[PDB]
Design an enzyme around this catalytic site. Structure first.
Site, PDB file in Angstrom:
ATOM      1  N   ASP A 178      21.101 -57.525-146.355  1.00 50.77           N
ATOM      2  CA  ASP A 178      20.020 -57.006-146.919  1.00 50.77           C
ATOM      3  C   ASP A 178      19.115 -58.486-146.615  1.00 50.77           C
ATOM      4  O   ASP A 178      19.394 -59.363-147.285  1.00 50.77           O
ATOM      5  CB  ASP A 178      20.349 -56.834-148.588  1.00 50.77           C
ATOM      6  CG  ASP A 178      20.882 -58.016-149.197  1.00 50.77           C
ATOM      7  OD1 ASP A 178      20.393 -59.236-149.315  1.00 50.77           O
ATOM      8  OD2 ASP A 178      22.089 -57.553-149.679  1.00 50.77           O
ATOM      9  N   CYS A 212      17.390 -45.725-139.781  1.00 51.99           N
ATOM     10  CA  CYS A 212      17.716 -46.794-140.773  1.00 51.99           C
ATOM     11  C   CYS A 212      16.778 -46.116-141.895  1.00 51.99           C
ATOM     12  O   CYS A 212      16.579 -45.086-141.653  1.00 51.99           O
ATOM     13  CB  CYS A 212      17.274 -48.181-140.266  1.00 51.99           C
ATOM     14  SG  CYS A 212      16.085 -48.258-139.222  1.00 51.99           S
ATOM     15  N   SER A 213      16.335 -47.136-142.534  1.00 51.29           N
ATOM     16  CA  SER A 213      15.360 -46.387-143.495  1.00 51.29           C
ATOM     17  C   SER A 213      13.875 -45.858-143.108  1.00 51.29           C
ATOM     18  O   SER A 213      13.557 -44.982-143.324  1.00 51.29           O
ATOM     19  CB  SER A 213      14.880 -47.499-144.843  1.00 51.29           C
ATOM     20  OG  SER A 213      14.101 -46.855-145.742  1.00 51.29           O
ATOM     21  N   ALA A 214      13.316 -46.706-142.117  1.00 49.96           N
ATOM     22  CA  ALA A 214      12.123 -46.440-141.430  1.00 49.96           C
ATOM     23  C   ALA A 214      12.326 -45.907-140.064  1.00 49.96           C
ATOM     24  O   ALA A 214      11.347 -44.969-139.661  1.00 49.96           O
ATOM     25  CB  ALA A 214      11.185 -47.480-141.470  1.00 49.96           C
ATOM     26  N   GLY A 215      13.205 -46.128-139.380  1.00 51.86           N
ATOM     27  CA  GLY A 215      13.524 -45.674-138.044  1.00 51.86           C
ATOM     28  C   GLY A 215      13.101 -46.628-136.990  1.00 51.86           C
ATOM     29  O   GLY A 215      12.637 -45.828-135.891  1.00 51.86           O
ATOM     30  N   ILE A 216      12.738 -47.757-137.249  1.00 54.45           N
ATOM     31  CA  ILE A 216      11.934 -48.635-136.121  1.00 54.45           C
ATOM     32  C   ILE A 216      12.536 -50.174-135.970  1.00 54.45           C
ATOM     33  O   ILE A 216      12.591 -50.584-134.776  1.00 54.45           O
ATOM     34  CB  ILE A 216      10.542 -48.959-136.326  1.00 54.45           C
ATOM     35  CG1 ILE A 216      10.132 -49.464-137.767  1.00 54.45           C
ATOM     36  CG2 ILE A 216       9.885 -47.315-136.370  1.00 54.45           C
ATOM     37  CD1 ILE A 216       8.839 -49.914-137.962  1.00 54.45           C
ATOM     38  N   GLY A 217      13.141 -50.492-137.153  1.00 57.95           N
ATOM     39  CA  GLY A 217      13.772 -51.939-137.070  1.00 57.95           C
ATOM     40  C   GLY A 217      15.037 -51.736-136.659  1.00 57.95           C
ATOM     41  O   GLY A 217      15.291 -52.007-135.341  1.00 57.95           O
ATOM     42  N   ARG A 218      16.083 -51.714-137.360  1.00 55.63           N
ATOM     43  CA  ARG A 218      17.420 -51.608-137.045  1.00 55.63           C
ATOM     44  C   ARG A 218      17.747 -50.472-135.911  1.00 55.63           C
ATOM     45  O   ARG A 218      18.272 -50.797-135.027  1.00 55.63           O
ATOM     46  CB  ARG A 218      18.365 -51.358-138.271  1.00 55.63           C
ATOM     47  CG  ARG A 218      18.615 -52.645-139.158  1.00 55.63           C
ATOM     48  CD  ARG A 218      18.388 -52.730-140.565  1.00 55.63           C
ATOM     49  NE  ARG A 218      19.268 -52.136-141.568  1.00 55.63           N
ATOM     50  CZ  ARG A 218      19.123 -52.524-142.626  1.00 55.63           C
ATOM     51  NH1 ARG A 218      18.484 -53.413-143.237  1.00 55.63           N
ATOM     52  NH2 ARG A 218      20.322 -52.283-143.449  1.00 55.63           N
ATOM     53  N   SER A 219      16.915 -49.473-136.127  1.00 57.17           N
ATOM     54  CA  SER A 219      17.362 -48.289-135.084  1.00 57.17           C
ATOM     55  C   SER A 219      16.747 -48.804-133.701  1.00 57.17           C
ATOM     56  O   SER A 219      17.354 -48.509-132.951  1.00 57.17           O
ATOM     57  CB  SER A 219      16.509 -47.315-135.661  1.00 57.17           C
ATOM     58  OG  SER A 219      17.106 -46.637-136.872  1.00 57.17           O
ATOM     59  N   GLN A 256      10.753 -54.963-135.752  1.00 55.35           N
ATOM     60  CA  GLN A 256       9.704 -55.338-136.520  1.00 55.35           C
ATOM     61  C   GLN A 256       9.418 -57.066-136.910  1.00 55.35           C
ATOM     62  O   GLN A 256       8.434 -57.268-137.244  1.00 55.35           O
ATOM     63  CB  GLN A 256       9.989 -54.835-137.884  1.00 55.35           C
ATOM     64  CG  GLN A 256      10.436 -53.482-137.959  1.00 55.35           C
ATOM     65  CD  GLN A 256      11.116 -53.103-139.111  1.00 55.35           C
ATOM     66  OE1 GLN A 256      12.018 -53.732-139.328  1.00 55.35           O
ATOM     67  NE2 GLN A 256      10.722 -52.042-139.879  1.00 55.35           N
TER      68      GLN A 256
END
Length: 273
Positions: A178, A212-219, A256
């Site tokens: 986190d 992931c939560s937004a779909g741009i960072g981890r994804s 990001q």
């Protein structure tokens, strides 16, 4: 080339490299995302799919879902990057993997208990099937393989409206820290190699859904290092900068932070074996 990494790393050239990628990125339209009726179908007002690459829910009253198709023919690689479903979008989520003949979904975030934050548990945790009558689907947990830094859930997706059945592999990377990025891409690399082992990313099946939560960072991180690891082993002269710029045309904001950028390099390097 890792010398590119060491050179960028010395001269402290990450914030600038990333800051550039942000300027070269072009902004396409995303009007459907903004329609009033679709307001509560988005987790973040600031993260929206481009109208030209967004995934459509076919034959639906409202065909909108915050998801993007990411095509990279140059690697025979294709994914659907989406946001972790909301309590009111779970059936849209599943309706989507069905219509896309998706064989696997890889989840990069943890399901948080707080529940003041949406984060719906969209797949079963026991022998009780989740039923989505609005879109006519059922999801049943066949078995779960719980490793150290991840877990794979075998799921049976049944179209109740026809008796047709499919088995989806739900890969859940559970150790992303986190806040911040992982110190080593070891556990992340193996996870990537395990989903590759299932063969769910091959152009045979439908696009795997990554989120992931937004779909741009981890994804984004997962997609990038996967495509790059395919551009290598195959062709050559991999320009992570442009490859990431071509991916940003299908979905905004991939990667990001400079740390995520840097981490992608590390993973592509170590994984390049």
């Amino acid at each position: 080339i890792e010398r590119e990494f060491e050179e960028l790393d010395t001269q402290r050239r990450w914030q600038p490299l990333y800051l550039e990628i942000r300027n070269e990125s072009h902004d396409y339209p995303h009007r459907v995302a903004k329609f009033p009726e679709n307001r509560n179908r988005n987790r973040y007002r600031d993260v929206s799919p481009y109208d030209h690459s967004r995934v459509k829910l076919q034959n639906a009253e409202n065909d909108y879902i915050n998801a993007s198709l990411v095509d990279i023919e140059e690697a025979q690689r294709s994914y659907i990057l989406t946001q972790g479903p909301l309590p009111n979008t779970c059936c849209h989520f599943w309706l989507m993997v069905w219509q896309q003949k998706t064989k696997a979904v890889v989840m990069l975030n943890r399901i948080v208990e707080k529940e003041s934050v949406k984060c719906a548990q969209y797949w079963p945790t026991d022998d009780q099937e989740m039923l989505f009558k609005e879109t006519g689907f059922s999801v049943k947990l066949l078995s779960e393989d719980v490793k150290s830094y991840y877990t794979v859930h075998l799921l049976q997706l049944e179209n109740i409206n026809s008796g047709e059945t499919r088995t989806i592999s739900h890969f859940h990377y559970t150790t992303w820290p986190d806040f911040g990025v992982p110190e080593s891409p070891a556990s992340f690399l193996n996870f990537l190699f395990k989903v590759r082992e299932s063969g769910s990313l091959n152009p045979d099946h439908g696009p795997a859904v990554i989120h992931c939560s937004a779909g741009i960072g981890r994804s984004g991180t997962f997609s990038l290092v996967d495509t790059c690891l395919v551009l290598m082993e195959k062709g050559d002269d991999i320009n992570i900068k442009q490859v990431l710029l071509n991916m940003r045309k299908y979905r905004m904001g991939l990667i990001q932070t400079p740390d995520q950028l840097r981490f992608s390099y590390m993973a592509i390097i170590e994984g390049a074996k």
